[PDB]
Amino acid sequence: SPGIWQLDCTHLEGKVILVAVHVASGYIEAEVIPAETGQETAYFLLKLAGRWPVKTVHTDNGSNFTGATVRAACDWAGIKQEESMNKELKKIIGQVRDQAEHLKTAVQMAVFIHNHKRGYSAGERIVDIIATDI
């Protein structure tokens, strides 16, 4: 449970956003990526796994997961494979879109808002969950 994430893609302004949610806490990491390719997906998963203890990722099982680069990345990082945040995040992105030149900045502001919003925030919940596991 504390090691379980769900990864989804969302599309805005021509670009692709990957959103990983830590299922037990609702905490999110999200990035705008150039294209929904195996190489970018692998890179996103490598970054996530270096930052938080990722044991299993639930994905949409689509084309960007079938290639050798993504497979090698999950294997290397030790990851196994196996929208109630999403409109909220879209909404937050809409709320802040005007204050940033670039979509990637608005996405990161929305991540900040989502994870900090508060009895506990998603940021407090993920730490409490993982600490409890340790």
Which residues form the interface with its own copies (CB under 8 A)? 29, 43, 46-47, 49-53, 76-77, 104-105, 108-109, 111-113, 115-116, 120, 123-124, 127-128, 130-132, 134
What mask of x and - would describe binding to ligand BMC in positions 92 to 131, judged by CB under 6 A? -----------------------xx-x--x-xx-xx--x-
User: Nearest CA to 10 among 19, 1, 2?
Assistant: 19
Which residues, including other chains, have CB under 8 Å from residue 76's CB and lie 6 or more apart? 46
Nearest distance, CB of residue 113 and its own copies, angstroms: 8
Question: Could you tell me if 112 and 91 are in contact, meaning their C-beta atoms sit under 8 angstroms apart?
Answer: no
How would you classify the pairing of strands 56-58 and 28-33? unpaired
What mask of x and - would describe binding to Cl ion in positions 3 to 32, judged by CB under 5 A? ------x-----------------------
What mask of x and - would describe binding to ligand BMC in positions 34 to 73, judged by CB under 6 A? -----------------xxx--------------------
How many Cβ atoms sit within 10 Å of the Cβ of residue 107? Answer: 25
Nearest distance, CB of residue 44 and its own copies, angstroms: 10
List the single partner that 128 binds among ligand BMC, its own copies, Cl ion, none, CB under 5 to 8 Å by kind.
Answer: its own copies
Q: List C-alpha distances in Å: 62 to 42, 116, 122, 132.
A: 13, 31, 28, 34
DSSP 5: E
